Design a protein around this ligand. Structure first.
Ligand code: MG
Ligand code: MG
Ligand code: MG
Ligand code: MG
Ligand code: MG
Ligand code: MG
Ligand code: MG
Ligand code: MG
Ligand code: MG
Ligand code: MG
Ligand code: MG
Ligand code: MG
Ligand code: MG
Ligand code: MG
Ligand code: MG
Ligand code: MG
Ligand code: MG
Ligand code: MG
Ligand code: MG
Ligand code: MG
Ligand code: MG
Ligand code: MG
Ligand code: MG
Ligand code: MG
Ligand code: MG
Ligand code: MG
Ligand code: MG
Ligand code: MG
Ligand code: MG
Ligand code: MG
Ligand code: MG
Ligand code: MG
Ligand code: MG
Ligand code: MG
Ligand code: MG
Ligand code: MG
Ligand code: MG
Ligand code: MG
Ligand code: MG
Ligand code: MG
Ligand code: MG
Ligand code: MG
Ligand code: MG
Ligand code: MG
Ligand code: MG
Ligand code: MG
Ligand code: MG
Ligand code: MG
Ligand code: MG
Ligand code: MG
Ligand code: MG
Ligand code: MG
Ligand code: MG
Ligand code: MG
Ligand code: MG
Ligand code: MG
Ligand code: MG
Ligand code: MG
Ligand code: MG
Ligand code: MG
Ligand code: MG
Ligand code: MG
Ligand code: MG
Ligand code: MG
Ligand code: MG
Ligand code: MG
Ligand code: MG
Ligand code: MG
Ligand code: MG
Ligand code: MG
Ligand code: MG
Ligand code: MG
Ligand code: MG
Ligand code: MG
Ligand code: MG
Ligand code: MG
Ligand code: MG
Ligand code: MG
Ligand code: MG
Ligand code: MG
Ligand code: MG
Ligand code: MG
Ligand code: MG
Ligand code: MG
Ligand code: MG
Ligand code: MG
Ligand code: MG
Ligand code: MG
Ligand code: MG
Ligand code: MG
Ligand code: MG
Ligand code: MG
Ligand code: MG
Ligand code: MG
Ligand code: MG
Ligand code: MG
Ligand code: MG
Ligand code: MG
Ligand code: MG
Ligand code: MG
Ligand code: MG
Ligand code: MG
Ligand code: MG
Ligand code: MG
Ligand code: MG
Ligand code: MG
Ligand code: MG
Ligand code: MG
Ligand code: MG
Ligand code: MG
Ligand code: MG
Ligand code: MG
Ligand code: MG
Ligand code: MG
Ligand code: MG
Ligand code: MG
Ligand code: MG
Ligand code: MG
Ligand code: MG
Ligand code: MG
Ligand code: MG
Ligand code: MG
Ligand code: MG
Ligand code: MG
Ligand code: MG
Ligand code: MG
Ligand code: MG
Ligand code: MG
Ligand code: MG
Ligand code: MG
Ligand code: MG
Ligand code: MG
Ligand code: MG
Ligand code: MG
Ligand code: MG
Ligand code: MG
Ligand code: MG
Ligand code: MG
Ligand code: MG
Ligand code: MG
Ligand code: MG
Ligand code: MG
Ligand code: MG
Ligand code: MG
Ligand code: MG
Ligand code: MG
Ligand code: MG
Ligand code: MG
Ligand code: MG
Ligand code: MG
Ligand code: MG
Ligand code: MG
Ligand code: MG
Ligand code: MG
Ligand code: MG
Ligand code: MG
Ligand code: MG
Ligand code: MG
Ligand code: MG
Ligand code: MG
Ligand code: MG
Ligand code: MG
Ligand code: MG
Ligand code: MG
Ligand code: MG
Ligand code: MG
Ligand code: MG
Ligand code: MG
Ligand code: MG
Ligand code: MG
Ligand code: MG
Ligand code: MG
Ligand code: MG
Ligand code: MG
Ligand code: MG
Ligand code: MG
Ligand code: MG
Ligand code: MG
Ligand code: MG
Ligand code: MG
Ligand code: MG
Ligand code: MG
Ligand code: MG
Ligand code: MG
Ligand code: MG
Ligand code: MG
Lengths: 46, 271
RNA sequence: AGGACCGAACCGACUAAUGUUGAAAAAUUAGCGGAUGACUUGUGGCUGGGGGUGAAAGGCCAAUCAAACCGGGAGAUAGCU
RNA sequence: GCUCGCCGGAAGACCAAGGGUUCCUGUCCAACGUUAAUCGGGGCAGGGUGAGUCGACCCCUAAGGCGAGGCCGAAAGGCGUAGUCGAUGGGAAACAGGUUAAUAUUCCUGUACUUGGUGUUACUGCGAAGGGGGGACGGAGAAGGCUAUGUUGGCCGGGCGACGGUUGUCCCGGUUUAAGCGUGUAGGCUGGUUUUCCAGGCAAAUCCGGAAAAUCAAGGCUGAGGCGUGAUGACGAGGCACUACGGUGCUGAAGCAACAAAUGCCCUGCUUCCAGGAAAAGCCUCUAAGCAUCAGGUAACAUCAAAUCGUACCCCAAACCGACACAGGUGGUCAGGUAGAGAAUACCAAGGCGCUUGAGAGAACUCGGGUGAAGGAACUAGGCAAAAUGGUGCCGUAACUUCGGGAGAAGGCACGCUGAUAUGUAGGUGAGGUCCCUCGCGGAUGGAGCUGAAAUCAGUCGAAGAUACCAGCUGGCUGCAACUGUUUAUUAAAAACACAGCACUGUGCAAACACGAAAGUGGACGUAUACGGUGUGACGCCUGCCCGGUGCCGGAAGGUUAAUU
RNA sequence: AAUUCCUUGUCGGGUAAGUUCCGACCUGCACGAAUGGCGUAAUGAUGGCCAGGCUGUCUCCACCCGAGACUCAGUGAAAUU
RNA sequence: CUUUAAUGUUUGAUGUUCUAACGUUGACCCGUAAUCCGGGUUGCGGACAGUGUCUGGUGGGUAGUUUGACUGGGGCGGUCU
C-alpha cells in the first residue's frame, strides 16, 4: 500500500519555502498572518 | 511501390505501406537541423486548446527554403531525403557558390538534376519565377500570396494549382480545394507538382500505428454524460438532438467563415 | 519480421477460502492475465474548483468529490425534533 | 560451547532518497519492550565522522520559472525581448596492502595522475561578444575476438583414521596480487599529398564549403585483450612463545597449465527497418578591431597551489511512507557449487537468522493438510471447490479458412543403470617439433594433451526409470464483440470505451476552432493527399421509400416590423 | 431473437424423464438496413448447452497429521449498561 | 380623378476611381549583441475592415427560480364560487 505522503526535501522548499512565499502578494500575507499569531517558526525551512 | 503485408499476425493483416528506395538512408545534413519539442496541444496557459494530440516519436526540424531567394546561380540536386515534419519529401541542393539548402522535391526530380531561380529561369519543373514570367495555363506549386513572403500554397504531397487567367496586375488561380482565387502577379511559384503522390495509398492497420504519430483516442459525444457534452445522456442509445460540437454549435452543414477584408480576392467558392 | 507464441523479474486483479473490535481503514493463501510494447519505471516540470484531466466509470484532483480543502459573511434559516 | 533447524536472485553485501546520533564504551532496570530481563534501537556520562583525485560547490544547458525596457488590463495584475536561473543530462585527475572499541579510495607504507600560478632558458606573430569542426545521440537482429568466473590436473603443506578396508588411480587445505608506465594485437572507419581559382559561411579568414590539374597508391584515425614492468615487494597454509586466554610478537613452502565461459568489454561498432531518433559549454582551428623590441603562444626544468561543505549509523528495513518494534509499499548495483533451457525449482557455500510469552494435555467445534471400500455429478442456481492432465524426440492429425491458421488438434511409441562399437565416438580446442618469413602479439604442416553429445546392439534391477520439486485437461453446438488494448483506486472487467477502416460537414491561412476583459498562445514553424467536429466501427454482400414537422443551405414580388426623424 | 406479453406457442433432435440448448415455421403484442442489416476464419480470466477422463461435490461419512479451543504461571482489552 | 413620356425637383440606395485618416501576422535600415517593441523608407488594402454608444432577432452556452390543496397511504380519476 502506497500512502499519500512521499517526502522530498527539494520539492518541500520549492513549494512551501520562505522564498516561495515572498515571491507573490498572497504569499507575503501568509507570513504577515503567521507573525500576527506569534508562531515560533514561519515556514517549513528547517 | 505500395505493398501489402502478409497476415502473419492480426495487426499485420490490413497493413499497407509505401516504400521509396530512392530516399537517403543515412543521417540528415547537420547544419540545417533544429529542435522542436512537443506541446500536447497546450498553450501558454497550460490548458488543452486542441484535443487528441500527445505522445509519438521524437523529431528534428529541417530548415526548408520557401522563398528561393538567390537568383541566377544554378543548383544541382544531391539526394532525396525523408522528412518527418511534412507529407512531402525534400531534396538537398548545392549551389555553384558552395551553399547547401533544402527544398521541396517536385515530381520527376532526381539526383543530378539542375534547378534555377530568378526572372530569366527556364520553364522546367523545379524552377521558381514571378507569375508574370510564367505562361498562363501552367501547373505550379509552392505559391506565394504576398511578394517576398515565401511559399504558402500547394505544399502537400501531390498538390498543385493552375494559372487560368491574367487580368491586369493580378492572376487567377484554381486551388486544389476547387475555388478560384486572385493573387498578385509579382508573387513567385515553382513549376510542377509536388512529389510523393502515392502518399495517400497507405493503411495504418492497427490502433498503435496512429499512436506513433502523436494522435490520441477520440471519444464520441454520445458516450458521455449530460454534464460533459450536449450529446451525452440516456438509458440505452438515445440521441434526439441536432448534432453539435462540444461547445454547442451546429456541426453538420453550418458555415463558419466570416472575414470581410479578404472576400474581394475570392472569385467563386469551392462548392 | 511481428501491438506473434510459452514462460521468470516487472506491471495487473478473474475465482474460492480466511479475516471482518483484522497482521492490514482493501490484505494473505492456492490458482489467474500481459510480459518488445497503445509497455513499465526513477527525477524534475505544467494544468486550480462551476475549474483541471478523463481509451468516458460522473471516474480522479492528498484515506474527502452530481462540484476539493482552510478562513470569513455567521449566532445563515429551521411553521421540525 | 557442542548439537538441531531456516534463507541463500535472499531473510546475503553495497548505493540513492528519507531519517538524524539510532554508531562504540562504561554504568542503571523506575517508565518503554504485548512475559521475565543481568539484555536493548530504553535512562545517564564519555568517545567517534580526517579528501587536489569520492559527492556537493563550480562551468554548460532541457522541460520550465523569473524578467530591465515593452505590449495589454478598473486596481491588484497577464504575457514577453535582452538576460538570468533551472538536472533527472555534457565537463580534469588514485590504486593495492595495513591499521581503531568505533573512520577510511580521506590515516599509514609502496607506487601514481590532473588542472592552474610564478621563475629561468630556447624559439615564435598573438588577439573575440564573431566563423568552422567536434561534443552529438533510434528500435530490433546476428556473429566473431575476449575477460570476470568456474572445473580438472600439476606443485606445496599436513593425514594414514572410534566399526570391515584405506601407502593409494587415497583424504583435507593453499595455489593471490591493483592503478600507472611501455608495446599495439583480433576487429572497425576512411584513398593520400601538392598547386591554382571562387556570386557561399552578416565583415575577414591561411579555417570550412565548392571547382580544376598533377602525382603516389599506401597513409591516417580508432581499438578489447595478451605480454613486460610495477613486484628481490605485499599476501600467504602453518608453525614457534606468551595469553593479562579477549589477542598479541616472529618466521613463512608452493604460488603453475589445460578446458569451459557471461546478460560484462571491443561495440557511440556491423546488418537492417521506419515510427526517421536533445541543447550548450569544456576541446581543436580561423581570423576582426588592436600590439609590435613589447604584450601574448609553444616547449624543457624548477617551485607554489588545489579553498569550502558532506563523510558516524539504518543496506527493500524494528531507524524511510503506513498512529505501533505493523504478515503492506520503496529506485539502482553484485550474482558461487550439483541437477537444470533458465535470474524457474530442489539441496548447499560465503554470510545471516530461529520471527520478545512459555509448560502440559491430546474432548466437541473451527482453520490448513494426507489417505479412503462399492458407486461415480446421483451434489448444486451452476462440476463452485477438489481430483485429474502436465517433459523431450519421432510418427500421426478432422470440419472450416481471410491460405497465415485451426494445431501442442485428437492419438501412439521410447525414456533407468552397465558393457561394446570406441581402454572416450562425431565434433570442439589445440603444446613441443619442422619449413618459410618483409624475425615478429606472423604464416604453412603436424598431432601430444584436454573436453565431449547423440545413436545402435547385448545384459541387468524394481510394482513403477518424464520416478522428487517443476510441469496443458480434451472434444461438439451456439449468442455478443472482428482482433492486441482501456475502464468504476476500495462489492460491476463486461456485450461497455478505444481501435484500424467508412461517410457527412466546416476551413484559402492573420485558416476554421480553443484558452484569454486584452495583449498574446495552441492549431503549426503545418498549407486542402492538410487541420477541426460529428456518427459508424476489421473484412464479404449491401445500404431501400418519405422533404409534411424541426434544423441547415440558397431566393426575394409582397405583408408586418427597432433605434432615428 | 440480448427484441415474443399470451408462452413451458407448434414441429424435429438429444434424456427414463429437458420452462434451459440446437434446427425450423411465421401469428414480427412491439426486427430492419452507417443511433447500420445479414454473414464471417482467428481471438476471449465473456453468456448458454452437451460428452470423455477424474474425483469426498454426494450416497454417508471414517481415520490420521499440525495451529487454536482446554488446564497451569506472567501481562492484560471491547462493544453494551 | 386615373393610365401615362419627359426638363427642371428634397432625398434613399447601388456601383466606379483617388489618397490623406486607418489596417498590414509583406520587404529593407536603426536603437542593437534582439524572430519582442518603437522609429524611418516603400509596396498592398483603403474610407472598406475594425472598435465605442444606442437598437430589432437569435441565444439551456450560462444563471436565478416556479411547478396548489383535498385524498380511508401516495399517484391516476374527480372536486375547489
Ligand atoms: Mg492512503
Ligand atoms: Mg513539508
Ligand atoms: Mg514534434
Ligand atoms: Mg509549437
Ligand atoms: Mg480547458
Ligand atoms: Mg481530432
Ligand atoms: Mg520532437
Ligand atoms: Mg496598384
Ligand atoms: Mg488513436
Ligand atoms: Mg476514427
Ligand atoms: Mg470514437
Ligand atoms: Mg465523435
Ligand atoms: Mg445520448
Ligand atoms: Mg455508453
Ligand atoms: Mg455512460
Ligand atoms: Mg471540463
Ligand atoms: Mg447541456
Ligand atoms: Mg448512453
Ligand atoms: Mg433503446
Ligand atoms: Mg444548443
Ligand atoms: Mg476565415
Ligand atoms: Mg507479444
Ligand atoms: Mg505469456
Ligand atoms: Mg515496484
Ligand atoms: Mg472484481
Ligand atoms: Mg480457486
Ligand atoms: Mg496471488
Ligand atoms: Mg504470471
Ligand atoms: Mg497471449
Ligand atoms: Mg516525480
Ligand atoms: Mg513525475
Ligand atoms: Mg496547477
Ligand atoms: Mg473559474
Ligand atoms: Mg468533471
Ligand atoms: Mg481521494
Ligand atoms: Mg466547486
Ligand atoms: Mg453548488
Ligand atoms: Mg467537472
Ligand atoms: Mg487535508
Ligand atoms: Mg466556508
Ligand atoms: Mg448578514
Ligand atoms: Mg447554529
Ligand atoms: Mg524453500
Ligand atoms: Mg527462488
Ligand atoms: Mg539485505
Ligand atoms: Mg541514504
Ligand atoms: Mg542524507
Ligand atoms: Mg537518544
Ligand atoms: Mg548498539
Ligand atoms: Mg550499552
Ligand atoms: Mg525487578
Ligand atoms: Mg516488562
Ligand atoms: Mg550479564
Ligand atoms: Mg543505549
Ligand atoms: Mg565528542
Ligand atoms: Mg583524495
Ligand atoms: Mg576536502
Ligand atoms: Mg575537494
Ligand atoms: Mg570529481
Ligand atoms: Mg527560458
Ligand atoms: Mg516592467
Ligand atoms: Mg491583466
Ligand atoms: Mg514572465
Ligand atoms: Mg546558469
Ligand atoms: Mg546530475
Ligand atoms: Mg550530469
Ligand atoms: Mg546524452
Ligand atoms: Mg557529471
Ligand atoms: Mg562501520
Ligand atoms: Mg579517514
Ligand atoms: Mg572503516
Ligand atoms: Mg583515494
Ligand atoms: Mg610559463
Ligand atoms: Mg560553436
Ligand atoms: Mg544505426
Ligand atoms: Mg539501439
Ligand atoms: Mg580468463
Ligand atoms: Mg585473474
Ligand atoms: Mg579467476
Ligand atoms: Mg559452472
Ligand atoms: Mg583457477
Ligand atoms: Mg573439469
Ligand atoms: Mg605431498
Ligand atoms: Mg605426504
Ligand atoms: Mg574408518
Ligand atoms: Mg578399522
Ligand atoms: Mg584509474
Ligand atoms: Mg584489421
Ligand atoms: Mg577547403
Ligand atoms: Mg582441464
Ligand atoms: Mg562518504
Ligand atoms: Mg560508511
Ligand atoms: Mg542506506
Ligand atoms: Mg531485498
Ligand atoms: Mg519488503
Ligand atoms: Mg509495541
Ligand atoms: Mg516483534
Ligand atoms: Mg516491518
Ligand atoms: Mg546467487
Ligand atoms: Mg545458480
Ligand atoms: Mg552452477
Ligand atoms: Mg544443462
Ligand atoms: Mg526441467
Ligand atoms: Mg550447466
Ligand atoms: Mg534449504
Ligand atoms: Mg555458514
Ligand atoms: Mg480437530
Ligand atoms: Mg472412493
Ligand atoms: Mg476404488
Ligand atoms: Mg468412469
Ligand atoms: Mg442434477
Ligand atoms: Mg437434487
Ligand atoms: Mg473448477
Ligand atoms: Mg490440484
Ligand atoms: Mg487427495
Ligand atoms: Mg470433427
Ligand atoms: Mg502433440
Ligand atoms: Mg477445435
Ligand atoms: Mg530398458
Ligand atoms: Mg552406455
Ligand atoms: Mg577433431
Ligand atoms: Mg538403449
Ligand atoms: Mg535394449
Ligand atoms: Mg522388468
Ligand atoms: Mg516440466
Ligand atoms: Mg512446460
Ligand atoms: Mg473429436
Ligand atoms: Mg444462427
Ligand atoms: Mg440465445
Ligand atoms: Mg472485445
Ligand atoms: Mg482483452
Ligand atoms: Mg485499474
Ligand atoms: Mg472496483
Ligand atoms: Mg478482462
Ligand atoms: Mg467503459
Ligand atoms: Mg481513421
Ligand atoms: Mg474572453
Ligand atoms: Mg483581462
Ligand atoms: Mg502558432
Ligand atoms: Mg508554430
Ligand atoms: Mg456503437
Ligand atoms: Mg465496416
Ligand atoms: Mg439510408
Ligand atoms: Mg424540411
Ligand atoms: Mg420544402
Ligand atoms: Mg416533395
Ligand atoms: Mg431526396
Ligand atoms: Mg433561408
Ligand atoms: Mg425426442
Ligand atoms: Mg439446467
Ligand atoms: Mg428461423
Ligand atoms: Mg435496432
Ligand atoms: Mg424502425
Ligand atoms: Mg439509421
Ligand atoms: Mg453493432
Ligand atoms: Mg459491416
Ligand atoms: Mg449478425
Ligand atoms: Mg456485425
Ligand atoms: Mg470460441
Ligand atoms: Mg463462445
Ligand atoms: Mg463459453
Ligand atoms: Mg455467471
Ligand atoms: Mg461429465
Ligand atoms: Mg457428508
Ligand atoms: Mg495431530
Ligand atoms: Mg488435533
Ligand atoms: Mg485461550
Ligand atoms: Mg482459568
Ligand atoms: Mg491465564
Ligand atoms: Mg471501558
Ligand atoms: Mg473598391
Ligand atoms: Mg492605390
Ligand atoms: Mg496607417
Ligand atoms: Mg508600412
Ligand atoms: Mg502605409
Ligand atoms: Mg516598423
Ligand atoms: Mg494601395
Ligand atoms: Mg485592410
Ligand atoms: Mg461596422
Ligand atoms: Mg439545462
Ligand atoms: Mg437559454
Ligand atoms: Mg437545447
Ligand atoms: Mg437550470
Ligand atoms: Mg435565494
Ligand atoms: Mg397532498
Ligand atoms: Mg386504509
Amino acid at each position: 500500500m502506497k500512502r499519500t505522503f512521499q517526502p522530498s526535501v527539494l520539492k518541500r522548499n520549492r513549494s512551501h519555502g520562505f522564498r516561495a512565499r515572498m515571491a507573490t502578494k498572497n504569499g507575503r500575507q501568509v507570513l504577515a498572518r503567521r507573525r500576527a499569531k506569534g508562531r515560533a517558526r514561519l515556514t517549513v525551512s528547517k | 511501390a505500395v505493398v501489402k503485408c502478409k497476415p502473419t499476425s492480426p495487426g499485420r493483416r490490413h497493413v499497407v505501406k509505401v516504400v521509396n528506395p530512392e530516399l537517403h538512408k543515412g543521417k540528415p545534413f547537420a547544419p540545417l537541423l533544429e529542435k522542436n519539442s512537443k506541446s500536447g496541444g497546450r498553450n501558454n496557459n497550460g490548458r488543452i486548446t486542441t484535443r487528441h494530440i500527445g505522445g509519438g516519436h521524437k523529431q528534428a526540424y529541417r530548415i526548408v527554403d520557401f522563398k528561393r531567394n538567390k537568383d541566377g546561380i544554378p543548383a544541382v540536386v544531391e539526394r532525396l531525403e525523408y522528412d518527418p515534419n511534412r507529407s512531402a519529401n525534400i531534396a538537398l541542393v548545392l549551389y555553384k557558390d558552395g551553399e547547401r539548402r533544402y527544398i521541396l522535391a517536385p515530381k520527376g526530380l532526381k539526383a543530378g538534376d539542375q534547378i534555377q531561380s530568378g526572372v530569366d529561369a527556364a520553364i522546367k519543373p523545379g524552377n521558381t519565377l514571378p507569375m508574370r514570367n510564367i505562361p498562363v495555363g501552367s501547373t505550379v506549386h509552392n505559391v506565394e500570396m504576398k511578394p517576398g513572403k515565401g511559399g504558402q500554397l500547394a505544399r502537400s504531397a501531390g498538390t498543385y494549382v493552375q494559372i487560368v487567367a491574367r487580368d491586369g496586375a493580378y492572376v487567377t488561380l484554381r486551388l486544389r480545394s476547387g475555388e478560384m482565387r486572385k493573387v498578385e502577379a509579382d508573387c513567385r511559384a515553382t513549376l510542377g507538382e509536388v512529389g510523393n503522390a502515392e502518399h495517400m495509398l497507405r493503411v495504418l492497420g492497427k490502433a498503435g500505428a496512429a499512436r506513433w504519430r502523436g494522435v490520441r483516442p477520440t471519444v464520441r459525444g454520445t458516450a458521455m454524460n449530460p454534464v460533459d457534452h450536449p450529446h451525452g445522456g440516456g438509458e440505452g442509445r438515445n440521441f434526439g438532438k441536432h448534432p453539435v460540437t462540444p461547445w454547442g454549435v451546429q456541426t453538420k452543414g453550418k458555415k463558419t467563415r466570416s472575414n470581410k477584408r479578404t472576400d474581394k480576392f475570392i472569385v467563386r467558392r469551392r462548392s
